[PDB]
Amino acid sequence: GLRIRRPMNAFMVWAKDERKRLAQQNPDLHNAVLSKMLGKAWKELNTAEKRPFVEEAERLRVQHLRDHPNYKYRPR
DNA sequence: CACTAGCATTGTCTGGG
DNA sequence: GCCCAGACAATGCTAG
């Protein structure tokens, strides 16, 4: 199989569909601009709106420990 | 034809101080 | 065990 990647955090879990939606609504905007828009929109969400994505990121974090128990993040 | 780095974001994590 | 500076998770075009 392929290399093991980091699990997605709450913002990244949410950004998957939202980036797609923004891209389709604004097909002239590059991903850098979309990212700036996504950052602001994520910050605008209230706690209740963020909750499912926060919860799903934690599930992904725990599952990553199960599927890849000896994984160690080694940046450079 | 094929590859590669860069861009931007939030949140999590690293090594070394 | 916090600080510092930064990598890297997804995305997909741009351009070399």
Side-chain angles (χ1 to χ4, degrees):
Chain A
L2 293 158
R3 59 176 293 267
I4 313 303
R5 297 174 170 278
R6 311 194 67 193
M8 277 184 287
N9 69 40
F11 167 77
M12 300 291 174
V13 174
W14 170 86
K16 265 173 64 101
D17 178 51
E18 267 307 287
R19 184 183 295 279
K20 208 96 175 59
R21 280 195 44 243
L22 291 177
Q24 97 84 19
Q25 293 172 184
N26 307 271
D28 300 321
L29 297 179
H30 297 169
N31 272 311
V33 189
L34 298 179
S35 293
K36 290 170 169 184
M37 296 163 71
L38 291 161
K40 280 181 184 309
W42 172 255
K43 297 188 171 163
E44 286 220 318
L45 294 183
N46 63 38
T47 300
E49 291 170 322
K50 283 185 179 115
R51 179 176 177 182
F53 302 95
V54 169
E55 286 173 355
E56 180 55 34
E58 176 60 16
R59 273 174 216 115
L60 290 175
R61 190 188 67 76
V62 177
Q63 194 60 33
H64 203 274
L65 298 184
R66 282 185 196 106
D67 299 335
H68 307 115
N70 288 359
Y71 170 88
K72 297 196 268 65
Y73 176 46
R74 301 254 162 286
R76 202 51 188 77

